[PDB]
Amino acid sequence: MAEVLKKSGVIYGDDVRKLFDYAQEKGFAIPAINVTSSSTVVAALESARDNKSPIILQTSQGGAAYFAGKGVSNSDQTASIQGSIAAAHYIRAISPVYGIPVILHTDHCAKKLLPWFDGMLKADEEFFAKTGQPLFSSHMLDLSEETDDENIATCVKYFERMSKMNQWLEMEIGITGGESLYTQPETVFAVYKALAPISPNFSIAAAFGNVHGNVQLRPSILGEHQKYAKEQIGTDNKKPLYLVFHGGSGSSQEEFDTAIASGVVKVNLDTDCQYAYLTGIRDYILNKKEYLMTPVGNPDGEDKPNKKYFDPRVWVREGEKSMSARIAEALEIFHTKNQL
Amino acid sequence: MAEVLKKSGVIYGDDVRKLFDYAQEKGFAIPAINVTSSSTVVAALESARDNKSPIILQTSQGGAAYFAGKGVSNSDQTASIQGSIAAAHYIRAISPVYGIPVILHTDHCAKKLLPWFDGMLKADEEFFAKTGQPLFSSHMLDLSEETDDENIATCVKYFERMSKMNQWLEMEIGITGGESLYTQPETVFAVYKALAPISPNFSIAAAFGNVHGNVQLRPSILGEHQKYAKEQIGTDNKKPLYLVFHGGSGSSQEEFDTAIASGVVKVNLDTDCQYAYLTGIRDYILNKKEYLMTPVGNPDGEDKPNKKYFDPRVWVREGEKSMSARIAEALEIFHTKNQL
Ligand SMILES: [Zn+2]
Ligand SMILES: [Zn+2]
């Protein structure tokens, strides 16, 4: 199953489960990087290559709509649909040159955003019939606001449709129902019971104090999810569930270690990467002031041109470098560094 | 031939000549916008849609390499090759949602950059055998530094290869040879004589004072190119040649009008769009100072978060708006506005 470590580009099907299985066997998680442009995609691909690590690229509903541009009407999810498709084609085309396995993912999709999910699945199915692979490696459903029965049932419908393409499905379950502030292991296993007969290519993001009153992070309950599933399945697998860590910003190295030791394979990163991307472009035109105010600028008088300095290939690059540095911090924390 | 005006997305083959023929018949030129990212692509597509106008998107050797990221070694043109391919797939996927005809182009490619040209043609041929269309609508060769005989002969080889996919070829001719500061009409017609029997899908960018001593712009010689070709061809077509205007920044409205009246269909825009793209992002973090310096910021104390302000979907958008405004100025000048 270690054949995925030598794969180049976006992986699909059993290769996604092989990567997550290798993550569970070796005891590391992969950061899931929210991307909104070709520049943020490159920052993530470069960081994972320079650290010899796999990476997960994901577009949120707003991030995918940004790939299409805010000028596109998103009232019918059209911008999110067309933008995620366009982002998928870009990532599929450029990731092989970085020589790392890449999981192409989509982020939270609530019940109201299901037209976005339906549109992506439609493009996935058209691409699968042509090439034998879908566009995205995986999709995420966030029906945590709905009842646990309706959330799981709707997940069942889509997973039946996605399993035709061997597509991975991530689902989120909360504390809705149908302590009381954390998803109980019985509820998490109810997700496994409904999805496992369809396909093993699914992951679960449960509520365990990861706010995204003051509920503290309870990473120990993740190990309870695995022990409960293992006892109900009847196997020697200590980590039968693929768990996801949403909203991990601010957690200590100890909380991440216990979560990864409980079978967490994926840790979402968004806001922290957005700020890092800004600081590089922030530090550029700040320390290069009056070099960009006009096409006149400095060092001398009006005789000097500013084309060398306002070139977007120069200063947007500074945002990529600082974003890649922040992702490298996560690769070290999650032990993803130097796993390929 | 006016059927191209209702086309959505990237056009290929005879549709490119139909658009250029409609440009010559109606007397307008189309701006060629250099793009380096998904954000600059969106700025151009949105500007042309909002002005009901066709648009040309082009990647230079450096711009295509930027689509792959500076971290990718470009010593073998690999970054330029892989980046242009990835940019082509992104533009093909997202342009239909803007509802405008789009010409996908690549910019200057000198003799030393021919490995970049060969790599793109290879991907074009693989895509053409699969889908019946190449990736790019057109490519540009810049062998103006070579002798006119070697420039034209090398153009002949590639045009023979590109005509198999009905691909458009733009070539540049200068003052090399084999006044003396401007390309003579006989030299321009020598290009037509060698390329026309292969395919009519070619355009010529001649030297006429467009520096890119102090040679003044000589747009009148473009009308001399057309009259010389018409007399040698023996036809009633007053504009048998498709002409391109490189380095038009700083030209007056009168010089553009006389050039377009001489059959110019394409005016390159690069530096002016780079600066416009910066000013929006420049004006953002300038007028929003200390709102981005930390994840603490303002208006109040440390109690307030800055996530709403350093979100790249917010401030990079400001760069798209100012870039789209600059492109709209060119659409008005070149009379491309309100032609669809
Ligand atoms: Zn979540
Ligand atoms: Zn030129």
XYZ file of C-alpha atoms and ligand atoms in Angstrom:
682
model
C 0.000 0.000 0.000
C 3.095 2.215 0.297
C 2.983 2.600 -3.501
C 1.131 5.912 -3.081
C 4.215 7.606 -1.613
C 5.803 7.629 -5.093
C 2.692 9.038 -6.805
C 2.814 12.438 -8.509
C -0.227 14.712 -8.475
C -3.839 14.250 -7.443
C -4.686 10.729 -6.269
C -8.063 9.007 -6.421
C -9.893 5.899 -5.312
C -7.981 3.325 -3.292
C -4.890 5.544 -3.345
C -6.624 7.986 -0.998
C -7.369 5.210 1.494
C -3.818 3.890 1.096
C -2.452 7.324 2.017
C -4.755 7.639 5.026
C -3.870 4.087 6.076
C -0.166 4.938 5.846
C -0.889 8.070 7.886
C -2.556 5.968 10.582
C 0.161 3.302 10.538
C 3.022 5.817 10.769
C 1.168 8.155 13.138
C 0.951 11.453 11.256
C -1.812 13.717 9.997
C -1.951 15.612 6.705
C -2.889 19.315 6.736
C -5.873 20.318 4.612
C -5.064 23.689 3.049
C -7.899 25.940 1.934
C -7.048 27.477 -1.448
C -8.639 30.425 -3.235
C -6.312 31.063 -6.193
C -3.476 29.682 -8.275
C -1.077 31.577 -5.995
C -2.342 29.906 -2.813
C -2.374 26.525 -4.574
C 1.295 26.959 -5.508
C 2.199 27.985 -1.952
C 0.736 24.733 -0.621
C 2.218 22.466 -3.305
C 5.665 24.021 -2.853
C 5.587 23.701 0.939
C 4.697 20.004 0.802
C 7.339 19.308 -1.856
C 10.106 21.129 0.033
C 9.225 19.103 3.156
C 8.792 15.767 1.311
C 5.196 15.489 2.462
C 1.734 14.770 1.048
C -0.856 17.535 1.108
C -4.614 18.051 0.945
C -5.952 20.935 -1.147
C -9.526 21.993 -0.476
C -11.870 24.693 -1.729
C -14.693 25.971 0.441
C -17.972 27.205 -1.015
C -16.679 30.777 -0.898
C -13.178 29.792 -1.975
C -14.490 27.902 -4.998
C -16.737 30.849 -5.865
C -13.637 33.032 -5.670
C -11.893 30.804 -8.224
C -14.660 31.975 -10.568
C -14.501 35.598 -9.377
C -16.935 37.602 -7.256
C -18.398 39.083 -10.450
C -20.110 35.749 -11.169
C -23.583 35.370 -9.674
C -23.480 32.689 -6.976
C -27.200 32.758 -6.144
C -27.605 29.344 -7.824
C -24.175 28.122 -6.605
C -23.023 28.633 -10.210
C -19.844 30.471 -9.201
C -19.040 27.846 -6.572
C -19.756 25.038 -9.051
C -17.841 26.507 -11.991
C -15.022 27.763 -9.770
C -14.449 24.430 -8.044
C -14.376 22.702 -11.438
C -11.883 25.236 -12.795
C -9.786 24.962 -9.633
C -9.876 21.166 -9.946
C -8.557 21.265 -13.512
C -5.779 23.673 -12.523
C -4.715 21.571 -9.537
C -4.830 18.347 -11.565
C -2.598 19.902 -14.224
C 0.057 21.559 -12.048
C 0.409 19.193 -9.071
C 2.406 16.454 -10.925
C 5.321 18.864 -11.445
C 5.717 19.053 -7.655
C 6.132 15.282 -7.318
C 3.900 14.809 -4.262
C 0.621 12.935 -3.694
C -2.255 15.420 -3.510
C -5.798 14.924 -2.215
C -8.246 17.267 -3.957
C -11.048 18.041 -1.509
C -14.010 20.379 -1.057
C -14.874 21.887 2.330
C -18.080 22.444 4.309
C -21.355 22.023 2.406
C -24.495 22.444 4.506
C -28.024 21.499 3.467
C -28.611 24.929 1.918
C -25.480 24.508 -0.243
C -26.504 21.148 -1.719
C -26.950 22.671 -5.229
C -23.186 23.267 -5.074
C -22.614 19.606 -4.160
C -24.948 18.433 -6.935
C -23.141 20.546 -9.534
C -19.703 19.208 -8.612
C -20.964 15.614 -8.624
C -22.378 16.226 -12.106
C -18.983 17.368 -13.385
C -17.336 14.500 -11.496
C -19.581 11.968 -13.230
C -18.977 13.451 -16.680
C -15.207 13.405 -16.126
C -15.308 9.878 -14.683
C -17.087 8.434 -17.725
C -14.439 10.052 -19.952
C -11.212 9.399 -18.026
C -12.032 6.797 -15.363
C -11.381 9.296 -12.548
C -13.573 12.048 -11.093
C -12.372 15.628 -10.842
C -12.121 15.773 -7.037
C -10.568 13.112 -4.827
C -13.176 13.754 -2.156
C -16.083 15.912 -1.040
C -17.329 17.002 2.366
C -20.917 17.186 3.612
C -21.791 19.306 6.660
C -25.317 18.355 7.703
C -24.349 18.654 11.375
C -27.142 21.220 11.793
C -29.723 18.633 10.695
C -30.883 15.708 12.810
C -28.463 12.799 13.089
C -30.944 10.560 11.254
C -31.443 13.007 8.382
C -27.716 13.821 8.278
C -26.749 10.151 7.992
C -29.550 9.294 5.550
C -28.630 12.154 3.213
C -24.988 11.086 3.515
C -26.097 7.589 2.488
C -27.742 8.848 -0.718
C -24.697 10.822 -1.842
C -22.197 8.149 -0.803
C -24.094 5.610 -2.913
C -23.687 8.022 -5.835
C -20.039 8.833 -5.050
C -18.973 5.201 -4.552
C -19.645 4.572 -8.256
C -16.512 6.669 -8.849
C -14.678 5.334 -5.759
C -14.841 8.903 -4.438
C -13.996 9.676 -0.816
C -16.686 11.258 1.372
C -16.018 13.283 4.507
C -19.003 13.974 6.752
C -19.440 16.113 9.857
C -21.605 15.123 12.825
C -22.308 17.384 15.780
C -24.438 17.377 18.923
C -27.909 17.641 17.379
C -29.155 14.117 18.052
C -32.790 13.562 17.179
C -21.517 14.982 27.661
C -24.250 16.485 25.470
C -21.701 19.002 24.124
C -19.600 16.278 22.449
C -20.512 13.698 19.823
C -20.851 10.350 21.573
C -19.048 7.238 20.264
C -22.396 5.529 19.627
C -23.387 8.393 17.325
C -20.050 8.232 15.496
C -20.404 4.475 15.023
C -23.929 4.979 13.660
C -22.223 6.892 10.844
C -19.840 3.983 10.265
C -22.691 1.456 10.346
C -24.567 3.237 7.542
C -21.620 4.099 5.275
C -19.250 1.127 5.598
C -21.436 -1.342 3.610
C -21.461 1.142 0.716
C -17.703 1.787 0.611
C -14.782 2.142 3.062
C -13.765 5.495 1.524
C -15.206 7.800 4.156
C -13.977 9.938 7.041
C -15.786 11.438 10.025
C -15.378 14.876 11.629
C -17.020 14.778 15.064
C -17.557 17.528 17.627
C -15.095 17.197 20.523
C -14.628 20.757 21.762
C -13.243 22.098 18.460
C -15.323 25.265 18.182
C -15.467 26.438 14.562
C -20.185 28.219 26.720
C -16.434 27.580 26.530
C -16.089 23.878 25.727
C -12.484 22.757 26.108
C -10.892 20.483 23.530
C -11.529 16.819 24.387
C -9.155 14.850 22.125
C -9.431 11.805 24.404
C -12.957 11.142 23.126
C -11.507 10.468 19.666
C -9.758 7.406 21.075
C -13.125 6.466 22.553
C -14.677 6.596 19.076
C -12.085 4.115 17.803
C -12.391 1.687 20.721
C -16.190 1.691 20.465
C -16.112 1.015 16.720
C -13.451 -1.687 17.115
C -15.532 -3.510 19.737
C -18.677 -3.286 17.596
C -16.888 -4.312 14.389
C -14.972 -7.153 16.028
C -11.463 -6.677 14.670
C -7.882 -6.127 15.784
C -7.739 -2.761 13.990
C -7.143 -0.146 16.683
C -8.107 2.689 14.290
C -11.062 1.535 12.157
C -12.341 5.109 11.677
C -10.721 7.854 9.604
C -11.082 10.980 11.747
C -10.744 14.642 10.751
C -9.700 17.621 12.912
C -11.584 20.816 12.053
C -10.666 24.131 13.640
C -7.383 23.056 15.191
C -5.900 26.551 15.381
C -4.675 27.266 18.903
C -4.305 23.636 19.971
C -1.087 22.563 21.665
C 1.418 20.046 20.338
C 0.143 17.624 22.993
C -3.492 17.838 21.854
C -2.468 17.243 18.234
C -0.332 14.250 19.236
C -3.176 12.588 21.148
C -5.592 13.275 18.281
C -3.236 11.826 15.660
C -2.625 8.847 17.951
C -6.416 8.348 17.873
C -6.475 7.951 14.094
C -6.836 11.559 12.958
C -5.527 11.762 9.390
C -6.565 15.288 8.355
C -6.296 18.678 10.087
C -7.971 21.663 8.446
C -6.013 24.896 8.026
C -7.609 28.079 6.704
C -7.449 31.315 8.698
C -3.822 30.810 9.750
C -2.833 30.377 6.093
C -4.834 33.448 5.037
C -2.923 35.669 7.466
C 0.455 34.194 6.503
C -0.327 34.828 2.827
C -1.015 38.492 3.595
C 2.115 39.232 5.645
C 4.465 38.612 2.719
C 2.534 40.981 0.463
C 2.106 43.191 3.535
C 5.840 43.331 4.277
C 6.657 43.987 0.605
C 4.874 47.251 -0.199
C 5.446 48.437 3.376
C 9.248 48.166 3.276
C 9.143 49.233 -0.401
C 7.050 52.363 0.114
C 6.911 55.046 -2.607
C 8.398 52.404 -4.883
C 4.813 51.497 -5.858
C 2.861 54.748 -5.398
C 3.305 55.781 -9.038
C 5.002 54.504 -12.212
C 7.495 57.235 -11.244
C 8.607 56.323 -7.718
C 12.263 56.236 -6.691
C 15.398 55.926 -6.101
C 16.037 58.979 -8.294
C 13.497 61.368 -9.817
C 10.919 60.681 -12.498
C 13.710 59.147 -14.614
C 13.327 55.789 -12.950
C 10.621 53.256 -13.830
C 8.752 51.133 -11.305
C 7.981 48.180 -13.604
C 10.529 45.994 -11.803
C 8.763 46.557 -8.463
C 4.992 46.515 -9.082
C 5.356 43.334 -11.170
C 2.795 40.952 -9.593
C 5.222 38.066 -10.138
C 7.474 39.743 -7.539
C 5.277 40.779 -4.612
C 2.543 38.132 -4.775
C 5.470 35.700 -4.609
C 6.267 37.181 -1.190
C 2.803 36.106 -0.062
C 3.437 32.586 -1.340
C 6.715 32.339 0.588
C 5.161 33.340 3.918
C 2.161 31.069 3.368
C 4.481 28.150 2.577
C 6.384 28.894 5.787
C 3.202 28.651 7.864
C 2.215 25.368 6.205
C 5.708 24.036 6.948
C 5.065 24.706 10.645
C 1.977 22.487 10.463
C 3.844 19.772 8.546
C 6.326 19.603 11.427
C 3.618 19.634 14.114
C 1.466 16.973 12.435
C 4.597 14.875 11.681
C 3.787 15.005 7.955
C 7.291 16.340 7.263
C 9.621 13.839 5.561
C 7.112 11.010 5.138
C 7.499 10.402 1.390
C -19.241 34.466 -39.736
C -20.894 36.554 -37.001
C -21.752 33.273 -35.243
C -18.656 33.673 -33.047
C -20.171 36.655 -31.218
C -22.550 34.274 -29.401
C -19.789 31.820 -28.425
C -18.978 31.202 -24.759
C -15.405 30.517 -23.673
C -12.187 29.804 -25.534
C -12.581 29.626 -29.316
C -10.437 27.667 -31.758
C -9.832 27.122 -35.443
C -11.956 29.063 -37.909
C -13.707 30.843 -35.037
C -10.508 32.770 -34.304
C -10.292 33.969 -37.909
C -14.014 34.780 -37.869
C -13.488 36.989 -34.812
C -10.491 38.742 -36.363
C -12.424 39.169 -39.616
C -15.323 40.717 -37.694
C -12.797 42.963 -35.944
C -11.447 44.120 -39.305
C -14.908 44.567 -40.826
C -16.253 46.572 -37.870
C -12.988 48.442 -37.273
C -11.981 47.503 -33.728
C -9.030 45.799 -32.074
C -9.088 43.316 -29.196
C -6.729 43.851 -26.239
C -4.368 40.991 -25.425
C -4.118 40.777 -21.636
C -1.069 39.164 -20.070
C -2.153 36.929 -17.182
C -0.081 35.416 -14.383
C -2.687 33.949 -12.008
C -6.314 32.972 -11.589
C -6.918 36.429 -10.096
C -5.591 38.284 -13.148
C -7.490 35.907 -15.447
C -10.740 36.723 -13.631
C -10.045 40.464 -13.826
C -9.751 40.231 -17.615
C -12.759 37.947 -18.139
C -14.943 40.156 -15.937
C -13.895 43.369 -17.690
C -14.711 41.981 -21.138
C -18.055 40.585 -19.956
C -19.122 43.834 -18.270
C -18.290 45.711 -21.498
C -19.849 43.105 -23.842
C -16.534 42.547 -25.583
C -14.270 39.692 -26.688
C -10.872 39.336 -25.049
C -7.472 37.752 -25.639
C -5.734 36.062 -22.705
C -2.021 35.417 -23.085
C 0.752 33.999 -20.929
C 4.350 35.034 -21.468
C 7.258 32.691 -20.794
C 7.669 34.199 -17.329
C 3.929 34.475 -16.752
C 3.383 30.822 -17.637
C 6.290 29.841 -15.384
C 4.589 31.833 -12.635
C 1.410 29.781 -13.098
C 3.590 26.859 -11.989
C 5.313 28.848 -9.224
C 8.865 30.179 -8.994
C 9.802 27.130 -6.905
C 9.675 24.978 -10.054
C 12.944 24.748 -11.977
C 12.530 26.505 -15.328
C 16.004 25.700 -16.678
C 14.436 23.230 -19.146
C 11.334 25.431 -19.675
C 9.497 22.877 -17.510
C 7.825 25.531 -15.352
C 6.812 27.533 -18.420
C 5.529 24.381 -20.143
C 3.630 22.960 -17.170
C 2.381 26.385 -16.090
C 1.006 27.327 -19.503
C -0.774 23.965 -19.697
C -2.261 24.430 -16.225
C -3.250 28.008 -17.059
C -4.847 26.774 -20.291
C -6.988 24.224 -18.453
C -8.084 26.833 -15.906
C -8.998 29.381 -18.576
C -10.838 26.774 -20.659
C -12.891 25.752 -17.625
C -13.846 29.167 -16.225
C -14.260 31.347 -19.333
C -17.664 29.891 -20.437
C -19.320 31.235 -17.271
C -18.469 34.766 -18.438
C -20.298 34.319 -21.748
C -17.678 35.952 -23.987
C -15.471 34.628 -26.809
C -11.907 34.194 -25.547
C -8.684 33.732 -27.518
C -6.115 31.755 -25.518
C -2.662 32.919 -26.599
C 0.993 32.649 -25.594
C 3.359 35.622 -25.822
C 6.931 36.155 -27.033
C 9.014 33.021 -27.636
C 12.507 33.654 -28.992
C 14.844 31.043 -30.459
C 16.324 30.275 -27.034
C 12.820 29.584 -25.657
C 11.867 27.049 -28.337
C 11.854 24.158 -25.792
C 8.911 26.006 -24.224
C 7.161 26.157 -27.612
C 7.865 22.469 -28.264
C 6.428 21.457 -24.889
C 3.183 23.373 -25.403
C 2.768 21.965 -28.917
C 3.216 18.474 -27.465
C 0.395 19.045 -24.978
C -1.662 20.690 -27.730
C -1.295 17.621 -29.945
C -2.210 15.210 -27.148
C -5.310 17.255 -26.293
C -6.269 17.621 -29.965
C -6.234 13.865 -30.589
C -8.492 13.410 -27.542
C -10.974 16.283 -27.903
C -10.570 17.643 -31.442
C -9.263 20.987 -30.137
C -5.802 22.016 -28.927
C -5.270 23.605 -25.533
C -4.308 27.079 -26.788
C -6.104 29.016 -29.507
C -2.808 30.425 -30.733
C 0.920 30.715 -30.122
C 3.446 33.445 -30.836
C 6.976 33.086 -32.205
C 9.506 35.906 -31.770
C 12.450 35.120 -34.038
C 12.820 38.813 -34.896
C 16.416 38.638 -33.628
C 17.235 35.972 -36.233
C 17.635 36.633 -39.945
C 14.424 37.179 -41.889
C 15.086 33.994 -43.878
C 15.691 31.865 -40.783
C 12.793 33.525 -38.935
C 10.348 32.785 -41.757
C 11.683 29.271 -42.397
C 11.397 28.301 -38.727
C 7.908 29.825 -38.708
C 7.103 27.613 -41.705
C 8.102 24.425 -39.859
C 5.974 25.188 -36.806
C 3.014 26.491 -38.810
C 2.969 23.236 -40.785
C 2.766 21.431 -37.436
C 0.195 23.836 -35.953
C -2.089 23.835 -39.012
C -2.861 20.157 -38.344
C -4.856 21.452 -35.360
C -6.082 24.599 -37.173
C -4.067 26.555 -34.599
C -3.409 30.268 -35.059
C 0.208 31.447 -35.300
C 1.398 34.965 -34.528
C 4.913 35.854 -35.658
C 7.092 38.911 -35.100
C 9.414 40.370 -37.738
C 11.830 43.214 -37.094
C 14.582 45.078 -38.927
C 17.225 42.344 -39.125
C 17.026 41.559 -42.836
C 19.665 39.144 -44.056
C 13.638 53.370 -43.509
C 15.972 50.676 -42.158
C 14.433 51.170 -38.689
C 10.998 49.917 -39.818
C 9.936 46.610 -41.341
C 9.347 47.190 -45.044
C 6.114 46.038 -46.740
C 8.095 43.671 -48.977
C 9.465 41.936 -45.878
C 5.990 41.685 -44.340
C 4.590 40.212 -47.554
C 7.432 37.672 -47.627
C 5.935 36.379 -44.373
C 2.502 36.159 -46.000
C 3.926 34.428 -49.083
C 5.458 31.622 -47.001
C 2.616 31.073 -44.513
C -0.567 31.623 -46.544
C -0.298 28.371 -48.589
C -0.092 26.428 -45.314
C -3.087 28.058 -43.604
C -4.732 31.510 -43.373
C -4.662 31.400 -39.549
C -1.688 33.664 -38.959
C -1.008 37.222 -37.828
C 2.051 39.447 -38.186
C 3.603 41.856 -35.668
C 5.984 44.159 -37.549
C 8.345 46.847 -36.278
C 6.939 50.330 -36.952
C 8.384 52.474 -34.171
C 6.783 50.484 -31.326
C 9.809 50.142 -29.056
C 9.359 47.195 -26.686
C 17.732 56.313 -31.162
C 14.182 57.554 -30.546
C 12.107 56.096 -33.381
C 8.651 57.660 -33.450
C 5.576 55.513 -33.989
C 4.849 55.109 -37.713
C 1.322 53.639 -37.876
C 0.960 54.782 -41.497
C 3.342 52.031 -42.625
C 0.797 49.441 -41.466
C -1.570 50.661 -44.173
C 1.369 50.325 -46.552
C 1.737 46.664 -45.564
C -1.900 46.026 -46.489
C -1.791 47.866 -49.822
C 1.403 46.060 -50.837
C -0.046 42.647 -49.974
C -3.345 43.446 -51.710
C -1.544 44.434 -54.921
C 0.626 41.302 -54.830
C -2.282 38.989 -53.977
C -4.633 40.533 -56.530
C -7.853 40.921 -54.563
C -10.376 43.523 -53.455
C -9.625 42.828 -49.779
C -8.256 46.071 -48.342
C -6.948 44.260 -45.226
C -5.513 40.880 -46.290
C -3.066 40.794 -43.351
C -3.924 40.319 -39.678
C -1.682 42.805 -37.865
C -0.739 42.962 -34.176
C 0.239 46.013 -32.086
C 2.939 45.250 -29.511
C 3.997 47.828 -26.944
C 1.180 50.294 -27.515
C 1.416 51.927 -24.090
C 1.695 55.696 -24.451
C 0.178 55.905 -27.931
C -2.540 58.469 -28.574
C -6.134 57.740 -29.535
C -5.267 58.947 -33.047
C -2.385 56.486 -33.491
C -4.577 53.597 -32.328
C -7.368 54.639 -34.706
C -5.051 54.725 -37.728
C -3.529 51.373 -36.740
C -6.930 49.707 -36.315
C -8.023 51.246 -39.622
C -4.993 49.477 -41.142
C -6.217 46.045 -40.062
C -4.737 45.775 -36.572
C -6.827 43.244 -34.646
C -4.768 42.761 -31.467
C -3.079 45.213 -29.079
C -0.875 43.802 -26.329
C -1.336 45.034 -22.761
C 0.974 43.984 -19.935
C 2.770 46.582 -17.816
C -0.251 48.892 -17.596
C -2.356 45.996 -16.286
C 0.334 44.982 -13.779
C 0.330 48.445 -12.201
C -3.474 48.652 -12.133
C -3.618 45.259 -10.401
C -1.272 46.534 -7.688
C -3.055 49.814 -6.904
C -6.195 48.080 -5.637
C -4.209 45.874 -3.266
C -2.017 48.923 -2.631
C -4.953 51.162 -1.695
C -6.461 48.445 0.524
C -3.804 47.791 3.167
C -2.751 51.448 3.007
C -6.165 52.880 3.924
C -6.710 49.872 6.234
C -3.454 50.212 8.166
C -3.015 48.421 11.516
C -6.064 46.405 10.508
C -3.645 43.837 9.033
C -0.475 44.216 11.132
C -1.496 41.463 13.559
C -4.420 39.080 14.152
C -5.143 41.629 16.908
C -5.444 44.960 15.087
C -8.324 47.362 15.692
C -10.977 49.111 16.115
C -10.898 48.196 19.816
C -8.165 46.383 21.745
C -7.021 42.794 21.411
C -10.682 41.730 21.697
C -11.264 42.213 18.006
C -10.250 39.700 15.328
C -8.784 40.618 11.954
C -10.027 37.566 10.020
C -12.601 39.675 8.164
C -9.866 42.002 6.862
C -6.822 39.878 5.954
C -9.073 37.429 4.073
C -7.399 37.165 0.631
C -10.850 36.999 -0.977
C -11.325 40.621 0.160
C -8.143 42.521 -0.697
C -6.942 40.597 -3.756
C -10.425 41.372 -5.091
C -9.489 45.059 -4.867
C -6.626 44.342 -7.258
C -9.013 42.633 -9.666
C -11.370 45.627 -9.657
C -8.637 48.140 -10.510
C -7.165 45.857 -13.171
C -10.610 45.423 -14.744
C -10.993 49.208 -14.760
C -7.747 49.643 -16.702
C -8.753 46.981 -19.234
C -12.095 48.765 -19.659
C -10.177 51.898 -20.675
C -8.498 49.914 -23.456
C -11.799 48.354 -24.553
C -13.158 51.870 -25.074
C -10.027 53.103 -26.870
C -9.777 50.091 -29.191
C -13.566 50.225 -29.821
C -13.910 46.655 -28.521
C -16.571 47.833 -26.057
C -20.118 46.706 -26.913
C -19.262 44.603 -29.967
C -20.950 41.333 -28.952
Zn -16.420 21.314 10.402
Zn 6.822 41.910 -29.864
